[PDB]
Amino acid sequence: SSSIPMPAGVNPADLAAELAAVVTESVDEDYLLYECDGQWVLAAGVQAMVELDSDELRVIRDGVTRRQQWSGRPGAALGEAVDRLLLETDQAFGWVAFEFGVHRYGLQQRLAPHTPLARVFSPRTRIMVSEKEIRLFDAGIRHREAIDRLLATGVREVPQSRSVDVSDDPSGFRRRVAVAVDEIAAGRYHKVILSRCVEVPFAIDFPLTYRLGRRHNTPVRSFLLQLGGIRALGYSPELVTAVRADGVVITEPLAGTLARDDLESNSKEIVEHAISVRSSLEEITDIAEPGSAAVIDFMTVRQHLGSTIRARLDPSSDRMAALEALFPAVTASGIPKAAGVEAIFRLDECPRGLYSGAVVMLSADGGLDAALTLRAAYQVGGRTWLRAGAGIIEESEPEREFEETCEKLSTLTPYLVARQ
Numbered sequence: 001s002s003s004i005p006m007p008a009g010v011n012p013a014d015l016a017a018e019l020a021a022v023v024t025e026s027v028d029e030d031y032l033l034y035e036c037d038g039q040w041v042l043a044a045g046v047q048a049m050v051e052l053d054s055d056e057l058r059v060i061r062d063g064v065t066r067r068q069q070w071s072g073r074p075g076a077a078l079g080e081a082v083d084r085l086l087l088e089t090d091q092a093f094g095w096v097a098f099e100f101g102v103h104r105y106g107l108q109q110r111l112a113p114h115t116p117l118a119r120v121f122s123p124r125t126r127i128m129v130s131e132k133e134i135r136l137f138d139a140g141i142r143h144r145e146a147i148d149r150l151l152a153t154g155v156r157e158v159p160q161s162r163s164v165d166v167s168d169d170p171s172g173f174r175r176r177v178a179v180a181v182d183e184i185a186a187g188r189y190h191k192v193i194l195s196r197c198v199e200v201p202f203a204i205d206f207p208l209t210y211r212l213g214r215r216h217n218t219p220v221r222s223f224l225l226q227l228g229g230i231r232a233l234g235y236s237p238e239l240v241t242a243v244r245a246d247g248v249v250i251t252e253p254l255a256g257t258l259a260r261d262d263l264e265s266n267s268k269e270i271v272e273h274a275i276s277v278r279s280s281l282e283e284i285t286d287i288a289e290p291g292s293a294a295v296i297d298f299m300t301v302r303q304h305l306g307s308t309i310r311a312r313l314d315p316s317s318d319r320m321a322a323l324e325a326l327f328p329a330v331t332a333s334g335i336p337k338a339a340g341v342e343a344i345f346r347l348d349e350c351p352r353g354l355y356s357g358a359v360v361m362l363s364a365d366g367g368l369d370a371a372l373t374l375r376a377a378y379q380v381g382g383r384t385w386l387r388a389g390a391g392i393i394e395e396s397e398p399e400r401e402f403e404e405t406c407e408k409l410s411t412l413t414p415y416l417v418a419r420q
């Protein structure tokens with residue numbers, strides 16, 4: 001592993017996104033860029049790919065596709081395949097669909113054939129960009145030369161963004177909210193997050209849009225990818241799960257959005273956060289060593305209220321079982337989870353795919369970092385879209401919930417750089 005000192009006056013997010021744009025374009029390869037605690041890890045090129053679908057698990061390496069049938073928990077099937085990738089490389093990267101978390105609640109039968117659950121790959125090369133340095137892992141002569149070419153040219157200036165209209169309601173979000181409210185009033189469930197897609201009528205430049213949005217967002221994690229026909233970027237507002245090599249499991253649920261003093265005193269925000277903390281604690285307990293489950297920094301301010309649920313991974317459990325136990329996040333699903341998830345199948349455009357799922361980074365040492373996929377842009381086929389939702393409770397009003405989606409979309413809407 002060779003290192004290059006980081007040039008002065010260069011933001012690591014800008015350089016990592018530029019390396020993903022220029023280097024990957026020149027060699028015409030798939031990639032995933034993941035931002036995790038000041039490190040921007042560019043996973044470049046697909047050495048091997050694990051595709052977990054509702055009805056099949058495939059492992060693709062050098063054009064050879066191996067197909068397997070699988071039963072039981074999807075986390076066990078994904079874990080087994082991902083552990084094999086990690087015998088060859090130090091790290092693996094990918095995304096996990098919202099649909100991966102439905103099996104736990106007895107909803108596997110509702111999934112159509114070929115429904116994607118997860119896409120995890122081992123990269124050919126890794127470029128780690130931080131404020132201090134640029135670290136190269138398994139970088140061939142072509143990659144080294146292309147990186148050197150980038151450092152010499154410097155970073156491109158970000159063009160002005162192109163606006164998008166979010167005022168239409170073609171999916172009938174308002175009507176769908178009204179149905180959810182009626183179901184809550186009838187005591188079917190307490191909460192459900194419903195969403196709407198917003199079509200972007202022009203092609204966007206993903207690395208340039210990523211750079212622009214990143215200068216106006218402070219996320220828990222962020223990502224930029226081009227993998228298997230999918231382009232995506234996002235500013236993850238929540239950590240679903242983080243598993244360390246030592247076995248420490250962390251989950252950080254968030255709630256609500258000087259005074260400041262209002263958020264800490266709001267009864268409606270305190271109850272929802274406490275219910276979620278209790279839910280996360282009950283789930284982490286199923287995979288944790290007895291008595292290791294604890295809430296650190298309960299209901300502390302982070303423009304939002306949040307808590308850190310910590311535990312120690314039981315020897316009879318694993319990282320995927322920890323991910324599966326916490327999936328999907330309460331933030332993007334519902335309370336109770338089982339009824340909330342089922343309501344999403346009926347009242348939301350399904351399959352959700354990447355939206356409200358997770359973007360993951362795994363390590364050979366047993367590490368796992370899973371960021372909740374929200375505040376993300378997607379491009380699949382000739383379709384470019386944004387997706388945002390809102391938590392629906394008994395008191396919820398359809399027109400108010402629609403305005404809330406507009407606010408959540410405003411994290412991306414002013415920062416869309418058109419493809420030139």
Ligand SMILES: CC/C=C(\Oc1cccc(C(=O)O)c1O)C(=O)O
Nearest residue numbers: 237254331374375387388389390408
């Ligand atoms: C930190 C997370 C808290 C919230 O974020 C969200 C929750 C649910 C859905 C979304 C979305 O973009 O669809 C979202 O951004 C909030 O807005 O209250």
